[PDB]
Design a protein around this nucleic acid. Sequence first.
DNA 1: GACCCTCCCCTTAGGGGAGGGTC
DNA 2: GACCCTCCCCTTAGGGGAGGGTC
Lengths: 277, 277
Amino acid sequence: KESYYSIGEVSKLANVSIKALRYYDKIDLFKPAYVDPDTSYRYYTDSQLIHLDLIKSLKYIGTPLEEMKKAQDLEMEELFAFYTEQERQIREKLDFLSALEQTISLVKKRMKRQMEYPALGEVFVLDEEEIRIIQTEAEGIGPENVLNASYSKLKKFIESADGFTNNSYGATFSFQPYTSIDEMTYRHIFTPVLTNKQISSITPDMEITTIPKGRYACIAYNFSPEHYFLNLQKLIKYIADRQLTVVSDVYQLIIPIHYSPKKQEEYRVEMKIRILD
Amino acid sequence: KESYYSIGEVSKLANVSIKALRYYDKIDLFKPAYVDPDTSYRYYTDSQLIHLDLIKSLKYIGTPLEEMKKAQDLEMEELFAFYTEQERQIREKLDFLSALEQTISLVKKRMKRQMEYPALGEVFVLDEEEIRIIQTEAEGIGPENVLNASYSKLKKFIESADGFTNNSYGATFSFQPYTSIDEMTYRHIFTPVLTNKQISSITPDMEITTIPKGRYACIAYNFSPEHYFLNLQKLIKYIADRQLTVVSDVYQLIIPIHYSPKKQEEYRVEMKIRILD
DNA sequence: GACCCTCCCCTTAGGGGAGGGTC
DNA sequence: GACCCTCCCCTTAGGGGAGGGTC
Ligand SMILES: [Zn+2]
Ligand SMILES: [Zn+2]
């Protein structure tokens, strides 16, 4: 009143940094009532401090400074609408985070899964829960043929749904009394899904199915060109000796263990086939 | 396999921009297996594409690239923990937005309130709902004395609670048969609160109370040095003529109408006193 | 003729000083 | 001796070209 505030005074009163005030000046969002033409000092009236309310509040909810310059130009009925938009945007983030929170949980459940596995290289018969997936025909693809680029299209879709990208790669093949690896070929290659949201227009060459819930003869181990086939043989023998009946393809899942370009790569292999009790 | 991918190929396969790939190279987060020493072209193996899974997923949840370089160096048990932290951080934002969504709603209710007021300059008797507030003693402060800087401390606290800053300024004074404005002085000055969260250590000079729910003789109008007092007189006369009994101080609320430094300032004044039916 | 490469400029909202006057 | 001012540099994660070789 009938006197001015120095930038530092305003800074203490409005709890805004002096740097912020200068910036808001330059950007023409909030300029001092008067600026001493000689010393360049900035002077503010007590009556204009009220404009920092709109700025401080809009800044709190994260609106762009360039956006604020528009807000302090609209009427109440328009500001009312402005806030209605913010609520629409908040609900949006709430849905996003709520879903993201769910996905992280699932990713953790499955992560803990392979961390607390009975024993490696040994065949176990456990009761598996369903695992939703997206697969495709593996036309002319086998164990010694696959490439990460083979899951390219599969990953693209998953990414547009789950947001997250798959970390594990899947394949399936007919249960046969194999003799050598060059004797086997993948039927489908797949990648697990984590979201329940409808993926963008999906192409007809992609199939959304699942790995049935049920009893499975499983075996897990760390990948090794040699152990890959020897372990399958081990699985096969287990079914043969117990005279078990297979009621599904052999499912294969390969998960990387570290993602560190410094240490030598190593993958976890998981094979399991569903049986009739 | 036994050949390389050009940056553009990797870009199409992993659905990552060529610009992003070069950047990830420079930043040493994801570098090409081989770079032609003459043409400087970047070449990627199909086996390293798997490192883009961790990057793409971590990028999705917004982790800093410098942070990813650490993530791809930890073990599964550690990555598991990493995600547990993300869930803690997500819950945090969920609480924040959920609360923010609530505050915007209240701000809108009250905003609509003064937009759909019966008539200006006229006294009305309506049933008001409670309005929580934070007030302080207005030692030596009156209508022709107040300054926005007088609410400085009050605003500081509100800001640390509601996050939002108050847009309306309040005051209260004893109901008397006033003759002139220099005859009146404010008892307390206050600012409304919007959050239900415990504000930081509050000083004992701040009082958290409310404007009681009840029947009030109200009057609203656009501020004018002259109309301010004439309208109070109008309120006073209304109580006197109906022989109404006042059971509260006169409450005053001043809200700005536009926050636009281009147009002439204008405020909305709201005065009301509680009566015994 | 597409592909790829290396600069170089630009973007949010100021925080950190440095060098140097001003209340 | 506090206060304030004007540069100037720095920060995230790349997107946009420009000028010019390369598959
Ligand atoms: Zn098929
Ligand atoms: Zn008191």
